[PDB]
Design an enzyme around this catalytic site. Structure first.
Site, PDB file in Angstrom:
ATOM      1  CD  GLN A  13      -5.376  -3.174  10.119  1.00 50.55           C
ATOM      2  OE1 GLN A  13      -6.351  -2.702  10.704  1.00 50.55           O
ATOM      3  NE2 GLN A  13      -4.132  -2.886  10.466  1.00 50.55           N
TER       4      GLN A  13
ATOM      5  CB  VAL B 251     -13.603  -5.474  11.998  1.00 58.50           C
ATOM      6  CG1 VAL B 251     -15.057  -5.712  11.634  1.00 58.50           C
ATOM      7  CG2 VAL B 251     -13.507  -4.680  13.293  1.00 58.50           C
TER       8      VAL B 251
ATOM      9  CD  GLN C 269       4.440  -1.450  -4.095  1.00 59.78           C
ATOM     10  OE1 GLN C 269       3.503  -0.682  -4.310  1.00 59.78           O
ATOM     11  NE2 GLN C 269       5.684  -1.033  -3.924  1.00 59.78           N
TER      12      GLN C 269
ATOM     13  CG  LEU D  89      -2.023  -1.198   1.102  1.00 63.19           C
ATOM     14  CD1 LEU D  89      -2.978  -1.110   2.269  1.00 63.19           C
ATOM     15  CD2 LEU D  89      -2.778  -1.209  -0.224  1.00 63.19           C
TER      16      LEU D  89
ATOM     17  CG  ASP E 282     -13.447  -3.441   8.002  1.00 61.90           C
ATOM     18  OD1 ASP E 282     -13.195  -2.584   7.129  1.00 61.90           O
ATOM     19  OD2 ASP E 282     -12.629  -4.312   8.346  1.00 61.90           O
TER      20      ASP E 282
ATOM     21  CG  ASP F  87      -7.828 -15.608  13.824  1.00 62.95           C
ATOM     22  OD1 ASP F  87      -6.867 -14.921  13.441  1.00 62.95           O
ATOM     23  OD2 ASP F  87      -8.270 -15.529  14.985  1.00 62.95           O
TER      24      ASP F  87
ATOM     25  CG  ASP G  70     -11.340  -9.603   5.802  1.00 62.77           C
ATOM     26  OD1 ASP G  70     -11.673  -8.895   6.769  1.00 62.77           O
ATOM     27  OD2 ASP G  70     -12.110  -9.865   4.854  1.00 62.77           O
TER      28      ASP G  70
HETATM   29 CA   LIG Z   1     -12.054  -6.627   7.481  1.00 63.22          CA
END
Ligand SMILES: [Ca+2]
Lengths: 270, 316
Positions: free
Chosen positions: B288, B292, B88, B17, B238, B299, B284
């Protein structure tokens, strides 16, 4: 046509984490119990609900076959899965208010479904999120103020997370000391001297050698650059020029990876 | 604490990012991941790449990561590192493995668009007529969410969009030609490459995984988010959830196939593919926002924890 792995891809190549046992021959009420289940659950996307259940039972049996802990483990499994079942929009911004409430709800389910296990399962997770959610709110406010609010907020950490954070900070700070000396343009001798009196002579010797390797690389790249420029000045067609330069790079940098690195440096201001 | 994830070589988490290892200059990019792994015996370092967005060239992110790897090795005395990159960050990790093969033991990519992103392409085309990209409701939604995540920047909107330039099909194609890897399959075959690579005399273990929460429906082709139930609270807490569904829908209409909102399954393939079945969107993958995720999402912390154990068992 045999299979490359015995377990689904998510788990293949790994071993299950250990189920914690207390003195009373029973499962130690720690987050380690939850980690065991989340492990098997990483494969939920590649298994049918039935296949998943069968796997967990087999994994529990492998560790606790023929013991009170096994029945106890299967019990938590029931309560955990009940949690997921009982667990069951405007394209706007994020608000720590709603996110805070959601955690309050999820915490409610954990108490009803997991009960006695709600604490070891989500205890740390809840604090971590609630705590961070606050720092975000304080950061996004009329406040000038913020520093004092964050300084105080950061005084609500547990003795475990504070220690864990200090250890991670110390771990990175050693790296930062080396990085700072590089940015300052420290010679290999200066790097060795400064690091020796902070990180010790072993790290100092490694850091000094690192500086020496970087200086030698810069010298070799700069010498190559002069030769590269002589080729570029010949006025050959782009394709021919690039091919001749590629050849020069291959002949000049023979340590594995350096020819590729020189090509990278050639594509910018260096 | 235990030794479940106690690898021989230190693990370096490599973000992607806009920049830095932080989201909105407050929370860790790899949410709760470094602390979790460290509690399990791993020596985990988090790269903090700022400045140039590109992975290539002098002072690019690749050179920044290379410098960081050397500083970690100098400080610790370890001789190699295990690189785990997201988005990236996977391309940045490939840079180091290519230029300094002797310093790397393994390369793992999470949601990395090795073959580019259809959304990045979409944005590229939109900007040809509208530099702001706001003329697009989807692009506007993307910028709104990701723009708020950019750290150490006084112009997040611009930086959030600039972060996509390195992920276009054209840019990644050039990158792959400049940094070849045995871990990549034949271009356009939607198949991965080799599980290991030999660079010089060094051997690297190559791995990857990606999220496929965004699935195509019927046919303009529709799209659905399989990470959330018919109605989930993640869509409220989220904001990236709905945004990634929209970006993923745009990708599906560009023939991307199942994706995580920014990266398709085919583009994510590298080395030994652990899984592409995770019901996750792009964020996810890194736990993030703030841990959430949808009710049907696995997980991500457990997945990473499991992989470091896998690395340990492989001898690295
Ligand atoms: Ca999420």
């Amino acid at each position: 046509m045999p299979l490359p792995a015995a377990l689904p891809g998510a788990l293949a190549g790994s071993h299950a984490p250990r189920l914690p046992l207390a003195a009373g021959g029973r499962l130690a009420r720690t987050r380690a119990v939850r980690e065991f289940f989340d492990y098997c659950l990483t494969a939920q996307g590649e298994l049918t609900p039935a296949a998943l259940d069968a796997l967990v039972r087999r994994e529990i049996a492998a560790q606790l076959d023929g013991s009170p802990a096994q029945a106890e483990a299967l019990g938590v499994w029931r309560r955990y899965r009940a949690y997921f079942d009982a667990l069951a929009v405007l394209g706007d911004k994020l608000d720590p208010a709603a996110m805070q409430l959601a955690l309050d709800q999820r915490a409610a389910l954990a108490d009803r479904t997991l009960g006695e296990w709600a604490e070891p399962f989500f205890g740390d997770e809840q604090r971590r999120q609630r705590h961070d959610l606050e720092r975000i709110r304080i950061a996004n406010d009329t406040l000038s103020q913020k520093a004092a609010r964050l300084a105080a907020l950061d005084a609500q950490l547990t003795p475990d997370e504070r220690a864990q954070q200090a250890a991670l900070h110390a771990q990175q700070d050693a790296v930062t000391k080396i990085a700072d000396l590089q940015k300052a343009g420290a010679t290999p001798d200066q790097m060795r001297a400064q690091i020796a009196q902070t990180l010790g002579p072993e790290a100092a010797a490694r850091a000094a050698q690192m500086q020496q390797d970087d200086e030698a690389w810069q010298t070799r790249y700069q010498a190559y650059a002069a030769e590269r420029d002589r080729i570029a000045a010949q006025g050959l067609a782009p394709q021919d020029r690039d091919a001749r330069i590629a050849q020069l790079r291959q002949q000049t940098f023979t340590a594995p990876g350096e020819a590729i690195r020189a090509a990278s440096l050639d594509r910018g201001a260096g | 604490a235990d030794t479940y994830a106690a690898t021989r070589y230190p693990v370096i988490l490599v973000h992607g990012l806009a920049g830095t290892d932080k989201f909105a200059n407050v929370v860790d990019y790899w949410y709760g991941i470094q602390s979790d792994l460290q509690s399990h015996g791993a020596k985990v370092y988090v790269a903090n790449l700022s400045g140039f967005q590109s992975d290539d060239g002098p002072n690019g992110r690749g050179e920044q990561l290379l410098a960081y790897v050397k500083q970690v090795l100098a400080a610790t005395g370890a001789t190699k590192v295990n690189l785990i990159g997201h988005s990236q960050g996977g391309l940045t990790s490939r840079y180091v493995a290519a230029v300094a093969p002797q310093l790397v033991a393994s390369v793992t990519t999470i949601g990395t668009p090795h073959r580019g992103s259809e959304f990045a392409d979409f944005v590229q085309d939109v900007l040809k007529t509208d530099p702001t990209g706001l003329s697009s409701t989807v692009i506007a939604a993307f910028v709104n969410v990701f723009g708020t995540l950019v750290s150490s920047s006084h112009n997040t909107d611009q930086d959030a969009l600039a972060a996509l330039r390195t992920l276009t099909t054209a840019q990644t194609a050039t990158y792959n030609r400049n940094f070849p890897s045995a871990g990549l399959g034949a271009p356009g075959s939607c198949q991965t490459g080799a599980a290991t690579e030999t660079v010089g005399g060094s051997q690297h273990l190559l791995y990857s995984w990606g999220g496929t929460a965004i699935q195509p429906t019927s046919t303009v082709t529709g799209a659905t988010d399989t990470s959330t139930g018919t109605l989930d609270v993640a869509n409220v807490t989220d904001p990236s959830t709905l945004a990634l569904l929209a970006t993923g829908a745009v990708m599906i209409n560009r023939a991307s196939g199942q994706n995580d909102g920014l990266v398709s399954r085919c583009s994510s393939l590298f080395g030994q593919v652990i899984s592409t079945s995770y019901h996750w969107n792009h964020l996810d993958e890194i736990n993030q926002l703030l841990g959430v995720r949808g009710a049907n999402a696995e997980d991500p912390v457990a997945v990473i924890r499991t992989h470091v154990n896998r690395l340990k068992l492989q001898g690295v």
